Each structure stands twice: as C-alpha cells, then as structure tokens.
Amino acid sequence: NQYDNDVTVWSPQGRIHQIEYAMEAVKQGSATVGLKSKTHAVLVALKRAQSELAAHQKKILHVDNHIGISIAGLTADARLLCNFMRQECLDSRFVFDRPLPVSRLVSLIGSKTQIPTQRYGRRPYGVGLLIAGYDDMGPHIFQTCPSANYFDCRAMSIGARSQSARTYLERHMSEFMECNLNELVKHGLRALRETLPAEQDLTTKNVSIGIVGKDLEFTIYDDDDVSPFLEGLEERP
Amino acid sequence: GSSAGFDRHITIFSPEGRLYQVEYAFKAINQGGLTSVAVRGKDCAVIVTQKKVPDKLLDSSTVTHLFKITENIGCVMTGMTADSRSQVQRARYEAANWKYKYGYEIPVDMLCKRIADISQVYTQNAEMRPLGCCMILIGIDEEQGPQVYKCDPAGYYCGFKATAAGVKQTESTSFLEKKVKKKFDWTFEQTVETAITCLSTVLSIDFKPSEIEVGVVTVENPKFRILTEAEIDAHLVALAER
Amino acid sequence: GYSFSLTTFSPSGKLVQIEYALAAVAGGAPSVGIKAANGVVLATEKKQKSILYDERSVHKVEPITKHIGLVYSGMGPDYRVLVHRARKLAQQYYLVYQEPIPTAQLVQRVASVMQEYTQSGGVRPFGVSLLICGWNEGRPYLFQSDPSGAYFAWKATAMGKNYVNGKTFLEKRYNEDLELEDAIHTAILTLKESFEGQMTEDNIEVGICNEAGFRRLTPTEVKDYLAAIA
Amino acid sequence: SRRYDSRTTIFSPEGRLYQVEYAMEAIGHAGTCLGILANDGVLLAAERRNIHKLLDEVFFSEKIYKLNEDMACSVAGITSDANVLTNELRLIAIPCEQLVTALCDIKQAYTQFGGKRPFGVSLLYIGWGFQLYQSDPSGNYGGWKATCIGNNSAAAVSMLKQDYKEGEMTLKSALALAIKVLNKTMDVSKLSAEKVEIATLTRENGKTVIRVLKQKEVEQLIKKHEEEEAKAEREK
Amino acid sequence: LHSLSTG
Amino acid sequence: TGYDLSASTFSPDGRVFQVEYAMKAVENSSTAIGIRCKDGVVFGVEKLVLSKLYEEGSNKRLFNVDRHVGMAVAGLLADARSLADIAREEASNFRSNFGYNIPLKHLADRVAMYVHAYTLYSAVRPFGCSFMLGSYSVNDGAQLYMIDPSGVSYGYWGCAIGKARQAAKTEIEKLQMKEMTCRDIVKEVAKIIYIVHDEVKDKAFELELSWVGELTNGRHEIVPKDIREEAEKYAKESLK
Amino acid sequence: ADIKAICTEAGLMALRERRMKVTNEDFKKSKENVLYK
Amino acid sequence: SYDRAITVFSPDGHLFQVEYAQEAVKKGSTAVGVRGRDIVVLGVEKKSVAKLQDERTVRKICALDDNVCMAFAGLTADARIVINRARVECQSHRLTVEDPVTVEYITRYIASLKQRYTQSNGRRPFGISALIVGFDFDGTPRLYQTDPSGTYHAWKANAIGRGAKSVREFLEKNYTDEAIETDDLTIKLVIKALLEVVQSGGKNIELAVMRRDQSLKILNPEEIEKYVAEIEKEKEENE
Amino acid sequence: YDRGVNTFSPEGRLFQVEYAIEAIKLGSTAIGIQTSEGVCLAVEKRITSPLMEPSSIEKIVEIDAHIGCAMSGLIADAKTLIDKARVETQNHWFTYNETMTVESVTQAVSNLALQFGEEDADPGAMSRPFGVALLFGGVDEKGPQLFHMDPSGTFVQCDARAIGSASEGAQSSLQEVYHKSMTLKEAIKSSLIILKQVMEEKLNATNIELATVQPGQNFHMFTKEELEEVIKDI
C-alpha cells in the first residue's frame, strides 16, 4: 500500500498500481462494444441511468465527420479526451484539408494520455475509449486504455461485464467481415446482450448505436432511432 | 549512525552532520564492478581501466569507459554507466562553452571544478539524487604540465599524482602511494607500465591486450589518444619480459 | 524543485537542520582566525589522507578580493559554492560603487545567502562556517558566518574539530597588542594543539591580510613560520 | 515531494499554527529586550548574549538597528531572520504603525502560503508622537507603553505592570525602570554594562535623535540603581 | 572573478 | 522501507531501486531479438496476441524512428511509444539542424540520455521499456544498440530483451552473425524466436520481422510477407 | 494548579519569617516564584 | 511556487482545514453585532486589558468604508489582511460605480476571498470570522456575518468568538422590536449581551456605533461605564 | 496526507471526488421537477436561528432569464460554479445572439469539475473538487429541462431529481408521485409536500425557496405571498 499512492512509483514487481487503478475505472463503466466489417464500423453502448427518473447517461460521442467514440468510465475525463480529439480532427481539416486518419489520431491520444502516467501529482485518464472510424484504409475499431496503450481491434468490448461480449465477439468474429450493416449492428447488439443480467433486456432507452461507413457519415442513433435495429434480433435463450 | 526524519532519503543533514544520500551515491560507484587507475608522470598522464565483455554478443568496440571530453582532455568514468555518460556530456558541453566564451582550451582543474560545482547542487537540493559516477580527467596543461583530477559525486575534487576509483580504489591507492614514495619522475613508458602493473597486481588478472583500455596525454603531443590493442600489447609484453 | 522549506521549527523552538549543519561544521578540519593590531591571520589544517593528493591543487584559504579572504570549517564543496557567491557579490558591489567591498558588507551578504538556504524550498543549510578576514579604513576585520546565516565579529576564534579547546587556548594567548607575526605564531600554536601528527609546510594553509591586502602564504613562508615554532 | 513536505502553513486540529507557536518558543529563548515609552522619548534595552571575551566590538549596536531617520528596532529570535526582516524594514521605509503593518503583513503572508517556515523573530519598534510597537512571527502587532520580549519576558512585563506609572515618566525615570527590570530578568546579580545595550530615541531641535548609550553612561545607570536599592535596604 | 576562479 | 519509492533516493547499497523495478517491467514482457549481420540488422519480435480480437498488426513493437533506423521495444508499450516519438523527434531535429541522417551512435546516445533524465528526480518515473535501435549505411555500416530503462546504451552483435532474454542470447551465440547476410539472419531470427517461445505458457504469438541493410539501400522496412512466411516455415520446421 | 501553588508558596514564605498571617508581600514573592524563574 | 492542496476533502466529506480555521475563530474574543432601527452597534470583548497596552493599536472594530465597518474574531493578522483587501476593493468599487459599496457587496467579496483561500493550492484558509455592519444607500441598516468557509448570512443580531453560543442564545431571547426602539436601548442590548460573557464588566468592552448618514463612532470608556451603570440600575427595579 | 488529490482507489474511484460527493449529504434538500408546463425548483433554507435573516439564504440562483440553479452542500463552493455559469452564459449570447441550451450551460459548469490538481497546474487552478451539487432548470428549444450535476462533473437530465441530506427519501417520494403528464402547479405542490415531510423544522413561507422557469415566462422566484398561497393547502 506504499507503492500504489502515486503514478510515478514502480512497484517491486515492475507494475504501476495507479495505472491499474485507473484501468479499473473503465471496468466500473457501462459495457460497450465496437466491431467493424469490410465497409462499416459500428459501436453499441448500453447506457446506464442512476435512477429511473433520470435520463440514461450518453456513452457515444461524435468526434468528427468520420470518427466517433464510445466512452467507459469517468464522464468528465471522457469529455476532456473527446474535446482534445475533436480539436485534433478540426486542426487536421484546417491544415491539410483532409480527415485525420483514425490510426494517426489514436496515436496522438495515446501519447497525450501517457504524459500524466509519468509525472508526479498527475493521474491517468480514468476513461476507456472505443473509437470507430473510416478512412482510406477502411474501417477501424481502436481501444484506448487509461494505461495510454491502444489496440487496433477487429471487435472490442469494454466496461462492466464486458468479457461476455468479448466471448461472443470471439465466437462470431469470422463472419464480421462479409456481413452487411444490419447484420453487423445485430452482432453488436447480441454481444452487448451478453453483458446484461438474465432478467434485463435491450430496450430503446439504454441502447445507443454509432455507425460509420464508406459513404456514410458517423451517425448516432438513440431511443427512437434504435428501434429499426432492435426489433430484428430475436429473444435470447 | 543516528537518523532523524528523512535524512536517509534526501540530501539533508543527519543528527551527527552527515549526508547519507551522498555516501550511498559513493557506494554506487562500486556497483559497476570496475576499477580505474590514473597515473601522472613527468611529461605524461595515463588512465587505465578494465573493460569487461561478458559475452561475444556485446560489441567490444562500444564498451568504453574512456571518453574524449576534448582534444587535449580525456577522462575515465567509474560507476553507473548512464550517470557516467551524463557527466561526460556535461563536461563536453562545459569545455565547449569555455572555449567559446573565453577563447582558449579549458584547464583540466577548472573542468572538474565546474563539474563538481554542478554535482554539489545535487547534494544540496532534495529533488534530485547525486550522480553515482566518478570522473578522472587527465590533460596536459600549458605550464603546470600533466594534470590528473578525480571528481566525485559529492562535488569534492583534487589534483593527483596518481589516483584510482572503483571497487579496488583503496588497494590501488596503497600500491600507487608505495610507488610514489620512491619519488621517481616516470617516463611515458614507465607511467603506462606503472598503471598497468597497479591494475594487474590489485586485480591479479595478468592482463591480455583486450581486457584494459589505456588513454594517454603527453607534453610532446598534448592530445588524448586511446591506445590500440597492439600498442597496449607492446606495454604488456614489456611488462611480462621483466 | 521542491517549494517547501526543509528547515522547520522543532517543538522546542529550534531550527534542527541548522543545528545539524553546525554539527557537520564541528566535524571539519580545524580553522583559526586571529585579528592582530596590524592585520588578520587565517590558518587551517589542510591535511590529506595520502601523498597522492596534490596539496597545491586545491586551497582551503581562498581570496575574495584584493583585501578579503575566506577560510572555512565544514564541507569543501559548500565552501567552494560560497566562495563563488562571495566573489560574485564582491564583483557586484565593485561594479555598482567602483570600490572594493568592505569586509562587513561582504560578510552580511554572504550570511544573507546562507540564511536564504535555511528558509528556501528544497535546500539544506550550508554545512560550513566561514572565517572572513579583511582590511578597511586602516583597520583589520575578522568575522565568522555560521550555517544559520549569523555573523559575529571575532578578535580571535576557532572552528571545526576541537574548536572549544582552541577557543579556550585563544582566551589565554591573545591580547589586543599582538602583531601580525606573533598572530601567525599564535594561530600555528592553536592549530598544533588540535593537530595530530606533525605540521609540515604542506599540511596546513595560512593566509594573512594587512594594509597590502590579502594573500595566502606560500609553503616556504609557512615552513619558516613552522621552524619558528620548534 | 508530498512525503518530505512538513506543511508549515496549515492549521492544527485545535486551530493553531504550530510553526508560529514554535517560532514564539524560539524567541522565548532569545535575549531579553525591553521597550519603555516616556513623555520625552522612548528606549530599547536589549540583553546582550554575545558576551564572549574574544568577540570584537565593531558594530554601532548588536540587536538594535536603525530603520530610517525616525525609527529604531530591536530583535529577539533567529539573528539571520532578524537581519532579513530589518533589511526589508529599511526597504519599506513613514509613520511607525505603517512600517510595522507592512512588515507584519510580510510575516503573516509567510504563515499563510508558500510552505516556508515563518520568520522566528519578534521585534520592538521605537519611533516618533513617540510610540513603541511589538510584532510577533504571526504578523500580529500591538502598541505598548512598556513591553518585553525574549528571555523572562513574562517577569519583565509583570514588573512593568506593577511599576510603570503611566503618563508621568521622563527619560531618566524610564531608564531607571529599564535597569531595575533588567536586573531581575537577567540572572547576573551585578548586570555589568557590557551585558546590556540601551538606545534612546528623543526629539531634539525638531529632529529625531537615536543614540546608543556609551558604556560609561550605562555603568552610571547601574550604579545609581544599585545605590537606590541599597537605600531601600537601609529601610530594613 | 575569472582570475580568482582560475588563478 | 521507503528506499525505493523515488528515483531520487539512493539505497544504502548505492542502487536506485525505481530503475530496477522499471527494468523488471521490461523483464516481464515478451522477447524481442535483434541480430547485426555482415550487411545489415534484422529485428524480430515475438508479439503475443492477448486475444483473437486484436487485428494483425496491433501493438506493433517494431517502430520506425527514422528512414534508416528501426526500433524494437520491450516493456511498457505506452512508454515504448513515447520513447519512439522522442527518438523520431531527435532524428528530425538532427536532420533539420545538421542536414543529414543521424548516425545510430548519436541517436542512441541522445535517446539514452533522455531516458536517463527520468532516473534522477522524484518528479518523474523511469521509463519501463528497453529498446534496440538498428541501422545500416554504406559508410558507418550495420549498427545495433540496446538502451535499458537506466539509460545504458551499448552496441551489440546480437541482443535480446524480454522474459526469454537469456535463452534467446544462448541461441544467438550459436550464430556466426559476422559473416552471414540478412537473407539468412531473418530465418535464424525466426528460428530463435520460435525456440524461445513458450507454448504451454502464454501462447499464440505473431512473428514481427523487420530489417535495415544494403539489400534495402539502408532503409528500415518490415520484412516482405513472402520472406517472412518462408522464415516462419523454416522456424516451424526447425522445431521438428 | 498555579493558584494553589501561589497560595502554598506564599504560606511557605510566611513560614520562613515565622509568621502565621500571610501578607501581600508574601503573595507577591509567590507570584515571581512559581510563575517565573 | 508552492502548489500543494492544503484544503482537501476528508473521507467524511469535510474540509478539515476549514473546520480548524473555524476553531481558531472560536478561540477569539467575543464580538457582538446588533442591527437596530437607525443604528448598528458592534461591541467586542477586549479579552484582557493590560495597563501598558496602547488600546488604540489593538482594535477589533475597523471601518471598511465611510458607511461600512466590521468587527472580527480569530487570528488578528489574517483579519488585517482581510480588512485591507476589503478596503482596497471598496475604493475600487467606489471608483467604478461612483457609489459607496453596499453591505452585501463587501460581505460577498470578503466571503468569496475566504472561499478562494479554502480552494487554492498552497494557501490555508483565513482563520477569522467577520461581523460587517453598515448602511445601504437607501438608509437600511444591515448586519452580515462571514465565516472562514466563505458562507455569509444576514442577521438581526449575532455574535462570534468564544462566547458566541451563549451570547447568541441571549440575543435570541432579548432581541425584540421594543429592545431596539431607540439607539440607547440598542446599545444597552449589545452591552447586556457582552456582559453575559465578559466577567469584569465595562472595562473589557470596546463598543462602536454607526448611525445613518454618520461615520463610525467609538464609544469612550466613560460612556460605556455610564451605560453599564444604567443597566445595573435597571436590574434592581426588575427584582 | 500522503495521498494526492488526483489519486485512484483500487476500485477505480477518484478519492477526492468521492469525498466531495459525501459532502452533499450534509447539505440542505433540494428538489427539481421538470414538466411540460415548466421547471420547478425547491430548496429548504435550514434556518439555524431566529435572528438569521431568511432572505440572505440564497440557494436558488438566477443563472439567466431562462435558467435557474438550486445548489446543495457547500454553498460557498457553488458561488464559483454559479459565476462561471452566468459568465459563460451571455458569452454565447455575445457571440451568437441567442440564449444557451440548459444542457450547454450544465456541460460548461461540468467542465469546471475535475479541473483541480496539486502539481503541473496553473496558479489559479483549484485544489479540491467543488463539494456542491447543482440542479439546473430552464426552458430552451427542447422545452423545459432539468439537469443534475455532481462534484464528479457528471451532468445528466432528470425528470425529477432530489439532492441534499434527504436525497434518498425525497427521491423515493418523487418516484412515487411523478408522472410525465402533470401540471406545473401539481409539481410545485408535490415538491413542497416532499420537502415538508423531510424538514427538521416546520414548513412555512420563510424557510423554503421556490422558483419556476416556464415556457414564455422568465425565471421567477416565489414571493412570501405566493409561497403562502400554495403552502396553505399542504
């Protein structure tokens, strides 16, 4: 308990406990799944409500015309990271008149989130991001961790009880590439269902879907607009 | 050996007036396991140090504790390798700045005076640790002749007729003191042989011309040169035949 | 760098780190400063642990101006830092006033620096006591600046190892009518009482300040003064 | 960094500032300093602790410093912090209360933010009407007619409280009171002139004169006080 | 200054 | 005990324990090797896949700090990428100031000093990654340096960083690297990486191959997929 | 405690002068005794 | 620059430094403020009155402006800084708006400064609580209380310091419209509230009043003695 | 202590953020209700003495002509957030000639939270989170809107949210009595009923604050007569 109070203290096992504690903040966040196909990248987020008289917390944020993220963890840190990424995407347009490639944006955010993990009195960003984008290289799904380490994933899932969604994604990863947009969104919703308890089910209130494609701008779909995606999938066993 | 508070964690005085962090930095010099010996002659100064290459994978051309701070000044480093490189880079920068600002080559005494002034701040400010390295600079002065200066983590510094640093610093110091007591202004070959004999006798290695690095400065050519394996082998054969 | 003071007040109202710096001072080589009628003498035990050390390479008695000199007792590198600070302050005073700095003013500025190091953030007090000798207005000046930044005007004093007995010796061996040469004799005697072994012309360092200014005695002059002892 | 921080400028659970109290404790072990106000002048009588026989006497005064042409001050505590505060006092200098207020503002700022240790120095200010002030490391200052800081300050303050006839004092009576108090506060039964330091501020010819009494005058004062005490003993 | 440091 | 909580604190035995813990962080990662042959340098990385979900190319431990320098990392990948950017900016500054490609010795000595700058103060922690910089040029020749969390940069003929570093070094010592060319050294690097890999322990690794030599005109590039697959087949066959 | 010590020491001063009646001078000496020195 | 969070949330949800500053206030001398009909009265217990103390310099009632004056309780040195800052801002607001500051405005600035010092790096909270009385531009008397946390409230009558609780209890019982009918009755109420805690009597009471369209007037000791005599006389007829 | 302000617990909680969240439970109970007819904000003044003037206890604040805020917890901490809300608003009007969305105001105030630190921070940066919880209520293009903000910077729209000491019981009562299609008068009456059963003191027109933001109309603080009109029922 002496090696875990600061982010600049290496534990004798070669680990930084503050970074792992910040990583646990993502595990405390609500589940979200980001998966891609040959032409599309979609994010499905299970919004959480503190009480039934309060709105469900938004998890999918629009970053750029071709890039959108799903957050898990501290919402204020998520807003800070989203503002940084929006500013970087806007500066790319202002300078090169071109969209910022997703692979080249996640690198900047992983370099930005690494600085606090090495300086005294700073803390890692207690937010994990699932970035879905499209560029000349096709669709991209990236997972950004509080450890400032990012992964280029075929299909990722982060948040509370997200490993069931990881299992579903691993089982059906082979058919993600060739399936159309509707099948991809249904796969994402089915993966997100694995994170729910047995009695709970996907409703329009707690499902948000962010889609980006080759000729399709990044669009976020909510309660009214989620129904065209939810009604297709059958009831789980 | 009393303590009170953080006198063992930062460079603040102990109850008896000791800086334990500086002493630990001194103990850090022996962590490398290498010993360097510098000997000053009538017209030359020599630095010798054992080079250890544990495996053939290591490029032996890069394992060098002999650093050319300037054309006329050389140094041998003992202790932590990274701190040694830091001190070498700082010494090179200070020598270049002295040459630029004053127009003439920096004297050997003043180079380590500046380096020790830099390292004294590390022993007064608590946000940094002292460098766990010891610099031995050798150079030919315009008037004073050969000069050898050891330069320690505490910011202490002094001139030397013959000094040594590292694990075997005290045994080599005793050997060199016994040699100096005979009061002989050694020639270049004699200084090189004395340094090599000191290192060999203290370490009991019977050196090969691949286990030691020798760097010399002489009055005739006041430039620092690192002896090649053939030049070192010549001195080794001369020592062996006697 | 740290912005918080490393020297704080103990519950007994003592600056403990300053006391520990003074303890470090009391473990240094003995130093004796004697103010004669016609000058001041600063003597110190510049003894090395081996013959390999170059005695003339580093000097414990260092000049500050043409008329002011220091000798320390404590830690060598701290004295070198304070020597550079004193020289820089003397240059500032000379540049401002086109006149060599008075001894008292230099002592005050140096003591101000030493005090600053007892209150500033992330630094420890200097582990040295400075004996400062000078000549101003046709009169000799001797001062002692301790780690706390406090300066005292001394007729004769001793610092470092065995400094209390050196002081007691100076009480019974100093009078205001002493001359510079007799002052050197008394300072060498004070060093000899705390000295272990024999004093050669190389293992002690003596400097003197008179109307001609401040100058550190060469080893030959120290040899003559030492032969005067025996 | 947080590990080695002593947090000097914080509040104790009882609402006290421990560093300020410890600085006041440090001053309690300093030399005795007296300040007495009269109708024609003020005086500062400081006990001299630098009484070694080999200590040279070159300065005009040891603990009594001149701040401007109208004011003088005396210090108790760390002498180097006293030098810093007196140099800042001269730089700031002006009415006496304004100077004391500025220096006390600096001292308080050192106890509120910055993380540095406070100035462990208490000051007695005398100036010109004639006024005497006392300032603590906390930056809390107050005017006084008679006051004492340093060693045996409580006993000196009680003696003044009992003996200080308010309003009806000239410089002579105030000096006699200073000697009488300093005799009891100091442990020396004789109180030779070499262990005390008296400076008087008076208005002469429309100008402020701050003069440190010569050792002969102080010996005369001590002799007069001891003769008066012997006369009192003649009653018993 | 420079001369004092060097000598 | 409090002697290891900061990098500005020396142990009573004169060792900075924070740097050693950062080194252990490197020793906890997968093995990356690099061999300097007669006419170039070849980097191989045993990049484990932690899950099948990561795409083929994620967590690339082989970087390009310049057009002629490649970097193989082991340890904290975030610190590895930070140091890769530091080396990239160092090479860019060298080119923008002096006007030519930075020598590998100077790049190693500069990035190593930047690393060492993090091993002195309590305001920062030492980097938790060790990296090898490899390069080739017609004038300087093939060069390979390794830099550890302490900041010690040493030239090498064959080096390995990771948890199987000792076994990899033992396998590397068998090679006559000073005579063979890159086209054979890629096969031998694949063989060594496959040998030191532990299938019963963390399994399902990917072989990340890169090189810089005269056959690439002194340019660090990923080994072409055909050559990489041939080396993979040779390495698999060597395991019987 | 200070008040009780004042009274006890004043009674002690009265005992020193072989008196049973404690005078104001006795209390005055008591205050300088217990509170100070 | 020293940048350390001196005031941090305790796990209980409290700002312990703020509570310690409030305790330091609770160790201060009792200051009582009463808002009457056409007068505002501030009476401060003088703690201990040494005969050698220049009572002019030690004053816990200070006029922030010509229409605003406050009496503090807590650390005198902190209170001096707060008073000086309030005076500087009073002059600035008079320069800008061309109108004397209202009691609400200066009270709000003082409380905001205190809160800023309870939420800034390297700064401990001010250890003083203030009772700020005055008159607005419309002639309405106003009394406000600020605490080290930074929260301020308007009071008909209030007390701060060591005897704050008992004096406030007394004021809750004897503050009535009849008791503030005249200036003399208001001053008598203030003196009674102070006498609930002050032991010796009128000697340890420094009382200062402020009337509409008038500056702060410090009551001389003879006036306070006369008022205490009046209260003592009125005590007998009620027995 | 040893811990810094920006320290993560092993469970992933920001220590100072949780400790500031615990500060709200000592604050007075505030209740905000959003209805199609407007937003009703109520708060208990918690008068601690008959001498204290109730009018000086301002816990419902005019952010702008269309937005009000009710604060709970450390009221002094809420002054900075209120000032930033009122300055950030009228800056949107300065540059775009339009009133801000209530969501935008709440987001701008939320960005202030978590902007605290010890090292590598600006001299004006805060040292601790804002130990206050805010209830913004206003009217915008989306009609009436009520948002809840907590010291973690997490702001979320709420149909009916209760903060403060009695947040649990008041929230339960709000869940029991809230339906989406109800009038603003019903919302005011229900909020007053919920407050009355949770106050330590007895409810009257002096120890509570009531405000309404209705479409068309501006932010309106209820006077004593208006308060007595609705209190006379319950």
Subunits adjacent to chain I (3 or more Cβ pairs under 8 Å): A, D, H
Resolution in A: 2.7
CA distance G24 to H97: 65
Tell me the domain boundaries of chain H: 1-239
At the fourth CATH level, which superfamily is domain I2-234? Aminohydrolase, N-terminal nucleophile (Ntn) domain (3.60.20.10)
**Closest Cα in chain D, distance from residue H233 (Å):** 32
Taking the alpha carbons at both ends of chain I, their separation in whole angstroms is: 49
Beta strands in D165-234 (DSSP E): 196-204, 207-212
Using a CB–CB cutoff of 8 Å, tell me whether E1 touches chain C.
yes
Instruction: Give B-chain residues touching D1 at CB under 8 angstroms.
Output: 127
CA distance D212 to D199: 4
**Closest Cα in chain D, distance from residue I18 (Å):** 21
Q: How many domains is chain F partitioned into structurally? A: 1
The three state secondary structure string of chain C is CCCCECCCECCCCCEHHHHHHHHHHHCCCCEEEEECCCCEEEEECCCCCCCCECCCCCCCCEECCCCEEEEEEECHHHHHHHHHHHHHHHHHHHHHHCCCCCHHHHHHHHHHHHHHCCCCECECCCCEEEEEEEEECCEEEEEEECCCCCEEEECEEEECCCHHHHHHHHHCCCCCCCCHHHHHHHHHHHHHHHCCCCCCCCCCEEEEEECCEEEECCHHHHHHHHHHHC
CATH topology of domain C1-229: Glutamine Phosphoribosylpyrophosphate, subunit 1, domain 1 (3.60.20)
Q: Under 8 Å CB-to-CB from A177, ≥6 apart: which residues?
A: A37, A38
Q: Under 8 Å CB-to-CB from I178, ≥6 apart: which residues?
A: A53, I33, I159, I160, I190
Using a CB–CB cutoff of 8 Å, tell me whether I47 touches chain H.
no
Residues B197, B48, F115, CA angle at the centre, nearest 5°?
150
Give me Rg for the CA atoms of chain I: 18
Q: What's the order of all strands across the beta sheet hosting C139-145? A: C62-63, C68-74, C128-136, C139-145, C151-153
Which of H50, H77, H78 shows the shortest C-beta gap to D161?
H50
Residues of F with CB under 8 A from a CB of B: 2-3, 6-16, 36, 109, 112-113, 115-116, 119-123, 144-145, 150-159, 169, 172-173
Of B54, A14, B61, the C-alpha closest to F166 is B54
CA distance D211 to D195: 18
Using a CB–CB cutoff of 8 Å, tell me whether D122 touches chain H.
no
CATH no. for A1-234 = 3.60.20.10
Q: Which of D4, D7, D117 to mutate to test the interface with B (most CBs of B within 10 A)?
A: D4
Of I131, I144, I134, the C-alpha closest to I214 is I144
Using a CB–CB cutoff of 8 Å, tell me whether H180 touches chain I.
no
Cβ of C121 within 8 Å of Cβ of H3? The answer is no
G–E contact: 3+ Cβ pairs < 8 A: no
Residues 53-82 of C with CB under 8 A from E: 62-64
Instruction: Give B-chain residues touching F122 at CB under 8 angstroms.
Output: 127
- Residue F86 sits in a domain whose CATH number is 3.60.20.10
Using a CB–CB cutoff of 8 Å, tell me whether D91 touches chain C.
no
Torsion of CA A80, A82, A86, A89, to 10 degrees: 120
Q: How many CB pairs under 8 A join C and E?
A: 9
CA distance D55 to C153: 6
| C1 and C117 Cβ atoms separated by less than 8 Å | no
Tell me the domain boundaries of chain I: 2-234
Cβ of F24 within 8 Å of Cβ of A149? The answer is no
Instruction: Give I-chain residues touching H121 at CB under 8 angstroms.
Output: 118, 121, 123, 125-127
| C106 and C93 Cβ atoms separated by less than 8 Å | yes
Which of D18, D26, D55 shows the shortest C-beta gap to C153?
D55
Cβ of A54 within 8 Å of Cβ of I161? The answer is yes
> Which experimental method was this entry solved with?
cryo-EM
Cβ of F53 within 8 Å of Cβ of A170? The answer is yes
Q: What is the DSSP letter of B49?
A: E
CA distance H212 to H205: 23
Provide the token pair at A40: 């599309």
**Closest Cα in chain D, distance from residue I121 (Å):** 15
Using a CB–CB cutoff of 8 Å, tell me whether A15 touches chain F.
yes
Instruction: Give C-chain residues touching B126 at CB under 8 angstroms.
Output: 2, 6, 122-124
Return the residue of F nearest to A116 by Cα.
F124
Cβ of F12 within 8 Å of Cβ of B61? The answer is no
Instruction: Give C-chain residues touching D23 at CB under 8 angstroms.
Output: 9, 13
Give me Rg for the CA atoms of chain B: 18
Instruction: Give D-chain residues touching F122 at CB under 8 angstroms.
Output: 1
Using a CB–CB cutoff of 8 Å, tell me whether I225 touches chain D.
no
**Closest Cα in chain B, distance from residue C178 (Å):** 36
A–I contact: 3+ Cβ pairs < 8 A: yes
To which residue do tokens 């330069």 refer? B151
CATH class of H1-239: alpha beta
Of I174, I143, I166, the C-alpha closest to I37 is I143
Instruction: Give D-chain residues touching F123 at CB under 8 angstroms.
Output: 1
**Closest Cα in chain I, distance from residue H20 (Å):** 16
* Type and span of the H or E element at D87: helix D79-92
The three state secondary structure string of chain A is CCCCCCCCCCCCCCCCHHHHHHHHHHHHCCCEEEEECCCEEEEEECCCCCCCCECCCCCEEECCCCEEEEEEECHHHHHHHHHHHHHHHHHHHHHHCCCCCHHHHHHHHHHHCCHHHCECCCCCCCEEEEEEEEECCEEEEEEECCCCCEEEECEEEECCCHHHHHHHHHHCHHHCCCCCHHHHHHHHHHHHHCCCCCCCCCCCCCCEEEEEECCCCCEEECHHHHHHHHCCCCCCC
Q: Under 8 Å CB-to-CB from F141, ≥6 apart: which residues?
A: none
**Closest Cα in chain D, distance from residue G36 (Å):** 6
Residues 83-142 of F with CB under 8 A from D: 122-123
CA distance A192 to A165: 6
Torsion angles phi and psi, residue B186, rounded to 5? -70, 145
D–E contact: 3+ Cβ pairs < 8 A: no
Task: List residues bridging with H104 in a β-sheet.
Answer: none
Residues of H with CB under 8 A from a CB of C: 1-4, 122
Of F44, F45, F91, F41, the C-alpha closest to F65 is F91
Instruction: Give A-chain residues touching F78 at CB under 8 angstroms.
Output: 110, 113-114, 117, 147-149
Domain that holds residue F153: 1-238
Subunits adjacent to chain E (3 or more Cβ pairs under 8 Å): B, C
A119 exposed, middle or buried (CB, 10 Å; 0-12, 13-18, 19+)? Answer: middle
Instruction: Give H-chain residues touching I75 at CB under 8 angstroms.
Output: 151
CA distance C200 to C192: 11
**Closest Cα in chain I, distance from residue D116 (Å):** 17
Task: List residues bridging with I52 in a β-sheet.
Answer: H155
Instruction: Give E-chain residues touching C62 at CB under 8 angstroms.
Output: 4
SS3 B19: coil
Beta carbons within 10 angstroms of residue A14's beta carbon:
20
Domains, chain B, ordered by start: 1-242 (3.60.20.10)
Residues 20-49 of D with CB under 8 A from H: none
Tell me the domain boundaries of chain C: 1-229
E3 Cα distance to chain centroid:
2
E–F contact: 3+ Cβ pairs < 8 A: no
SS3 D195: helix
Which of H15, H112, H175 shows the shortest C-beta gap to I79?
H112
Cβ of A111 within 8 Å of Cβ of F81? The answer is yes
